[PDB]
Amino acid sequence: ENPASKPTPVQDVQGDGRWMSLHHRFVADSKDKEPEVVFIGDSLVQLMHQCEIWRELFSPLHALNFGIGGDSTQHVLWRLENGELEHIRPKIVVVWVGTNNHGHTAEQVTGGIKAIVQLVNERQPQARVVVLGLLPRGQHPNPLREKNRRVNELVRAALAGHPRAHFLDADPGFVHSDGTISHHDMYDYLHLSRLGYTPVCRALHSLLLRLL
Amino acid sequence: ENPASKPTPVQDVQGDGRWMSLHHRFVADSKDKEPEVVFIGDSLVQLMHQCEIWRELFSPLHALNFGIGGDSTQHVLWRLENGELEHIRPKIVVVWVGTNNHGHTAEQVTGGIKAIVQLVNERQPQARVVVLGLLPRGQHPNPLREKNRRVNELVRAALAGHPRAHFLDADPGFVHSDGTISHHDMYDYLHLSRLGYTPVCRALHSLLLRLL
């Protein structure tokens, strides 16, 4: 198996059960609500709900945010299989995950993203899927930039022939000419500041509006 | 040794060097600035700079935020020893760390907090130190709540006899009568929402103003 595409929950090694609490909250959300758009992924998804305004762009679209910080592809795959797509019939599912897949190759991460798209295509066949590219990270040039770029190439190639599957590069050019990423854009060179989120969210929002 | 009080940097096992970038940024901050207050700790400190307004309460006090998500006590101790207290002469240092010290007992975590206070007392003897209590976490009752409470008891007892060392319980009562924490307060039952931050920041700000 590709570990990136074998669905598995996060194991609690801390003791407070937070990841399963989040999953259960989302399951309840889907049971009780009727979203047009559901967003799922890692902290870049989750903190959009706080740290960008979410309220002005995405709230109007009738959206649920199932981001969880730290998730890898296989965790998002498990969550979609285990309740978060039940009781709903979204028009669009937005996926943003793979930057946390440490120890997986770029090809394995791509297989995890492809597996997520396929599950959504099975469980929610009416939905369009939007996959976001993995953003650059690290203050300076480093292997995860190359990795992330290579996933993006491979995912873009995989989705090119997919009528209702859409790859979106949301990066406005966070890596400057000198190789650096500004902490004004990503405060810790991974996570977006409010300023970082603006261009990202703008780009997503445009696409969503087109599709919708 | 108590692992919580043996200073050690976070080892990069991902490859993008972000933790050392953050440390180096803070070192540069201290080299170039003249804070009256420096805040140091984990993500509860770091995201105050974003996710609470920071700008209206803490900015006026001439403050630097050296929070880093994921740090344990020993990481904060290393960072203070390795450059982040150089070139400055703050009136107050605010410490908030120990919730991430997984695998350390409550007594070991307390020893790490005590070690941090002692280092600040050595390197910046004019400064008052403010330690925040560890907040509850997890949606429901769990061992980390008891752990965190027990650190708070032990730290409060340790600091009681310390003229210029101040323990602040900033918890307004996030654990409700039914044992639960609301995701409106902590979106993932650890990290504070903007709403969660308001009472916390209010309480800190009051204390700071008294002291100052």
Torsion over CA: B47, B50, B53, B54 (sign): positive
CB within 8 Å of A19: residues ≥ 6 apart: A9, A10, A12, A68
Torsion sign (Cα): B42, B115, B107, B19 = positive
Which of chain B's residues have a Cβ under 8 Å away from the Cβ of A136? none
Q: Do B137 and A16 touch (CB under 8 A)?
A: yes
Q: Position B43: which residue type?
A: S
Query: What's the sign of the alpha-carbon dihedral A42, A47, A53, A58?
Result: positive
| A53 shares contact with chain B (CB less than 8 Å) | no
Strand pairing partners for B132?
A: B168
Instruction: Delineate the domains of chain A, giving CATH numbers in brackets.
Output: 1-212 (3.40.50.1110)
CA-to-CA separations, B203 to B175, B209, B210, in angstroms, rounded: 17, 10, 11
Tokens of B135: 């907040």
CB distance B205 to B58 below 8 Å: yes
**Which residues 173-202 of chain A have a CB within 8 Å of chain B?**
183, 187-191, 193-194
Test mutation, B12, B16, B53, B180, chain A, max A CBs within 10 A = B16
Q: How many CA atoms lie within 13 A of A188 on its CB side?
A: 20
Q: How far is CA B54 from CA A184, B81, B114, B207, in A?
A: 15, 26, 27, 15
Give CA–CA dist B193/B170, Å, rounded.
15
List C-alpha distances in Å: B120 to B69, B86, B164. Answer: 21, 11, 11
C-alpha A152/C-alpha A146 separation (Å) is 10
Q: Do A188 and B14 touch (CB under 8 A)?
A: no
Q: Kindly state the tokens that stand for A63.
A: 């959206």
- Can you tell me whether residue A89 is helix, strand or coil? coil
Cross-strand partners of A131:
A95, A167
For residue B155, give Cα distances in angstroms to A196, B67, B82, B115.
Answer: 38, 20, 24, 11
CA–CA distance, B48 with B67 (Å, rounded to integer) = 9
Q: Look up residue A173 and give its two tokens.
A: 């050019």
Give yes or no: A188 in active site: yes
Give the C-alpha separation, B141 to B131, whole Å.
24
Query: What's this structure's resolution in Å?
Result: 1.7
> What tokens does B180 get?
């639960």
Task: Please give the Cα distance from B203 to B211 (Å, whole number).
Answer: 13
Determine which one of B5, B43, B49, B72 is catalytic. Answer: B43
The dihedral through the CA atoms of B191, A57, A173, A118 has a sign that is positive
Q: What's the rounded Cα separation, in Å, for the pair B184 and A149? A: 36
Distance CA B71, CA B17 (A): 15
B71 is catalytic: no
Q: Is residue A197 helix, strand or coil?
A: helix
- The DSSP code for A186 is B
Q: B41: which 2 tokens?
A: 């700790």
Min Cα distance A151 → chain B (Å) is 16
Sheet holding A37-41, edge to edge: A63-67, A37-41, A92-96, A128-132, A165-168
Those residues whose C-beta lies under 8 Å from the C-beta of residue B177, and which sit 6 or more positions away, are: none
Q: Which residues pair with A168 in a beta bridge?
A: A132
Cα–Cα distance, B66 to A115 (Å, whole number): 39
Give the strands of the sheet with B63-67, arranged side by side.
B63-67, B37-41, B92-96, B128-132, B165-168
H-helix or E-strand containing A54? Answer: helix A54-57
Three-state SS annotation for chain B? CCHHHCCCCCCCCCCCCHHHHHHHHHHHHHHHCCCCEEEEECHHHHCHHHHCCHHHHCHHHCEEEEECCCCCHHHHHHHHHHHHCCCCCCCEEEEECCCCCCCCCHHHHHHHHHHHHHHHHHHCCCCEEEEECCCCCCCCCCHHHHHHHHHHHHHHHHHHCCCCEEEECCCCCCCCCCCCCCCCCECCCCCECHHHHHHHHHHHHHHHHHHC
Q: Is A50 in the B-facing interface, judged by CB distances under 8 Å?
A: yes
Block residue for tokens 């903190």? A47
The number of beta carbons lying within 10 Å of the beta carbon of residue A129 is 22
CA distance A97 to B20: 24
CB A54 within 8 A of CB A205: no
**Torsion B110-B114-B116-B117 (CA) sign:** positive
**Inter-CA distances, B191 with A9, B137, B186, Å:** 21, 8, 5
